[PDB]
């Protein structure tokens, strides 16, 4: 399912891009001949008038051949004879179509309802502080409500995450933090963690003390703790947060534990021995927290507006990532090669189809942004070539044209091999 899902994803993406190219071209009286999808020997081709469609064997890329692109043909249907601005529009049609596709699928997903954890929308209340972390070190007591950082005013945990990732990308270190408790806005000087590489603020949201799953073969499974049941107390200790149950289990360290479980309206004093698991010398109970999720369905117009906003935010984030990469801020190992695309597509497919759709939107946006950079033998380089010819009024020298095309082919090839070996390195771990 994974490999075929990756294949169909790459196929629909390249088809959308080349179809945008083709429709923009047909809206300007040109003749298209090759509609090659991918590379290698064409697996099968069907002819319909001038437009001969084919599909090839190796689906990595895809390119389209027109009539009179750069040849010295004076026929009106020749692409070379066309005005430079129309050629620029033809070049931009691809990424523009990709962006339109991403916005449309995002809006469709939003209208169909997205499933998100409920804590992602509730007000920012710190239900648990990680021990000896930045939040604890600065002095964030549990139950404190964060109202502002730097910037981006925060009201939802999603807003806090977005502000944190933006601050990490911006390379800010010391940040003013307006935190509220008992009507006191206590300004603090927080240290922004490099959330790009994993480290976080050590702030946890409120989580109800209820079990949603149990590992089969776990001692809790042998005791009889079925999933979907809430737990009242542990050894009589008043606990109102699942993280407090986690703390109690962590401090048990193998001691016999008497869990007062509220079994759907009745109290059971279950006895457990969560000893030090020989796998890591750690407490083992084989439990799963009960995750809570909500499905949202925005109004169609409001869904479209939200999709536009999200597309703008993701475009800004990708542009910032590109700028950081060109400045050395982010290492080259974070690039996503086609094999990484395959593995993440398989992960999305096994996750579901709506996650598959949103990941398709994100990767389509990534492809559209990538194909816009100024680079020979790319959907962005020809824009630069035609703009140069337009501003100077004459075509680029033919020898310079050959040099430009050759160096572009070389750099594309070498970067593809580099990202390929990066993919193999990722596969190794």
């Amino acid at each position, epitope marked *: 399912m994974g490999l075929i899902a990756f294949l169909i994803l790459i196929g629909v993406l390249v088809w959308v891009h080349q179809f945008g190219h083709f429709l923009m071209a047909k809206l300007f009286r040109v003749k298209v001949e090759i509609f090659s999808i991918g590379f290698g020997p064409p697996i099968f081709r069907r002819q319909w008038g001038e437009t001969v469609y084919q599909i090839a064997a190796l689906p990595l890329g895809g390119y389209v051949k027109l009539y009179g692109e750069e040849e010295n043909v004076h026929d009106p249907r020749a692409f070379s004879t066309k005005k430079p601005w129309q050629k620029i529009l033809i070049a931009l049609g691809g990424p523009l179509f990709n962006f339109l596709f991403t916005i449309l699928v995002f809006a469709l997903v939003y209208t169909a309802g997205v499933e998100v954890p409920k804590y992602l929308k509730e007000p920012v209340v710190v239900g648990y502080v990680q021990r000896d972390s*930045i939040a604890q*070190k600065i002095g964030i007591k549990p139950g404190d409500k964060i109202i502002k950082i730097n910037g981006y005013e925060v009201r939802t945990w999603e807003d806090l995450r977005d502000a944190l990732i933006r601050l990490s990308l911006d390379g800010v270190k010391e940040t003013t933090l307006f935190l509220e408790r008992n009507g006191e806005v206590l300004h603090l000087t927080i240290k922004v963690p490099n959330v790009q*590489k994993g480290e976080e603020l050590g702030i946890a949201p409120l989580v109800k003390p209820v079990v949603g799953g149990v590992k089969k073969g776990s001692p809790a499974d042998q005791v009889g703790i079925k999933p979907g049941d809430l737990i009242l107390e542990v050894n009589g200790k008043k606990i109102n947060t699942w993280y407090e149950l986690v703390e109690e289990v962590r401090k048990s360290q193998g001691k016999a534990i008497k869990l007062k479980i509220l079994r759907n309206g009745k109290m059971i004093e279950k006895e457990l021995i969560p000893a030090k698991d020989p796998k890591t010398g750690t407490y083992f109970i084989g439990l799963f927290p009960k995750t809570e999720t909500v499905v949202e369905k925005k109004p169609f117009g409001e869904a479209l507006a939200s999709a536009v906003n999200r597309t703008w935010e993701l475009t800004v984030l990708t542009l910032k990532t590109i700028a950081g990469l060109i400045t050395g801020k982010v290492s080259f190992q974070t690039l996503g090669g086609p094999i990484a695309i395959a593995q993440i597509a398989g992960q999305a497919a096994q996750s579901g189809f709506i996650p598959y759709l949103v990941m398709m939107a994100f990767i389509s946006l990534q492809l559209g942004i990538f194909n816009l950079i100024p680079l020979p033998i790319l959907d962005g380089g020809l824009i630069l070539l035609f703009a140069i010819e337009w501003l100077r009024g004459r075509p680029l020298p033919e020898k310079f044209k050959e040099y430009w095309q050759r160096v572009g082919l070389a750099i594309i090839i070498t970067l593809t091999i580099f990202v390929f070996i990066n993919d193999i390195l990722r596969l190794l771990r």
Partner: antibody
Amino acid sequence: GSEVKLVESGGGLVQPGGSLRLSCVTSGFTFTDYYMSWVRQPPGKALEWLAFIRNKVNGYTTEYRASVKGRFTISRDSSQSILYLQVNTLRAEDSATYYCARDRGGNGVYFDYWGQGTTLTVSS
Amino acid sequence: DIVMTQSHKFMSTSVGDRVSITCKASQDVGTDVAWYQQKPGQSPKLLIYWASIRHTGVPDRFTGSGSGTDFTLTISNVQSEDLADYFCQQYSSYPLTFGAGTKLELER
């Protein structure tokens, strides 16, 4: 302002069974905002963490290595940026270089700035 | 408690080469690991924390990697000012523990 600076004092030769207090004078940073520790470095042996003390907002609580609890005491001065470490019942195994250190604010205590260290020799 | 085991007490290298210093934890510590450098007669100096985050002011030659139990400090393009002792440290659980250290020896 001045850069981070830590200077230890109180080392020297001390007979077994005695007591003394080591000092660490700090400068260049707000003293009450950072964890302080007394990790030790014996000659040609690995580092041994001894204790650390939390900030003002955390009640100045202390954490100790189990082997030295009840023997070693870490503390801060009331009105000066000076850290102290009282040590009693000294034995020959305590002879080492004692380092005072300022920790970063990241996740979990690590030591971002170290003092020069002071050498203690315990023998009769 | 948690024991940080550096299998090599000495490691040979030349100026301009790459060195990989290994460190093995007694149990899973995730990524709560820091690395330090100590030159003769000087205090230790933190280079990397969280397995892969370079400290401010540390040159790009020092890189850390690894997760779980087999963390590694790689020094690309060894310069002459790197002849020193390098050791790891974990802060996943108390008490905090250090490695025994690794001394850089020059080849000839």
